[PDB]
């Protein structure tokens, strides 16, 4: 991936290594950012641990509503989507169209990802 080569070089680093499915995994200030190409998109994903999300089987609705309210509140300025994965665990995602993405843009969305994580994580932990 030209973009990831460019980003690595811009940071003065060796090129990043992808797994066999072409997924990259960067840990940035302790936050995992997965970058996964699918067809014409590049998808950023950070799984979130949220112990208070469910007590046993019971989903915390007050929390879920609050997080979805925040998701709407950030929508105009951040492209990120809050979702539930196949384990029913929260994940912060961003779907980027490769037709329109340059290295600058990738870096900006990564910056935005970390910004939102730093806002969210404190609400889901001690």
């Amino acid at each position: 991936q030209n973009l990831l080569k460019n980003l690595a070089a811009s940071l003065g680093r060796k090129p990043f290594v992808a797994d066999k499915q072409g997924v990259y995994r960067l840990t940035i200030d302790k936050h995992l950012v997965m970058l996964a190409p699918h067809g014409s998109e590049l998808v950023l994903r950070t799984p979130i641990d949220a112990p208070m999300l469910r007590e046993g089987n019971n989903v915390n609705v007050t929390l879920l509503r609050s997080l979805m309210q925040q998701a709407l509140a950030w929508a105009k300025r951040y492209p990120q989507t809050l979702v539930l994965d196949d384990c029913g665990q929260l994940v912060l995602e961003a779907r980027l169209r490769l037709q329109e993405l340059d290295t600058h843009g990738l870096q900006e969305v990564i910056n935005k990802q970390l910004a939102l994580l730093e806002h969210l994580i404190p609400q889901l932990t001690p």
Binding site: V59, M68, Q69, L72, T81, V83, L84, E93, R95
Partner: protein, 121 residues
Amino acid sequence: SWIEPIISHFCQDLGVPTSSPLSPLIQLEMAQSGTLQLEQHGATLTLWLARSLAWHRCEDAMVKALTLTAAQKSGALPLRAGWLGESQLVLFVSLDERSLTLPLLHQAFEQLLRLQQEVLA
């Protein structure tokens, strides 16, 4: 606004006349599906589709909306989910102004309604 013709045409395709010039925020009220807003902000057109739910319908809608907007479960468009106040499910998609077309706008609308429908099934 140069995108007015696309929005005007979209509205006319739904049988809704509009007077020119159009506002940067157009609001269409749907009898069952709720409130659709077409908002031009910066170089983006975002469709927001908001619907008030009865209390006993809210929890399952939250979970399904989050589940069905995961990239793995999604289609061509970046549909997203949120919530407003007590009881309004909000589904939305942002479109880049510089590549907006009438067919794109129609599918954004149709795919938001489809999502809402799966979310509330």
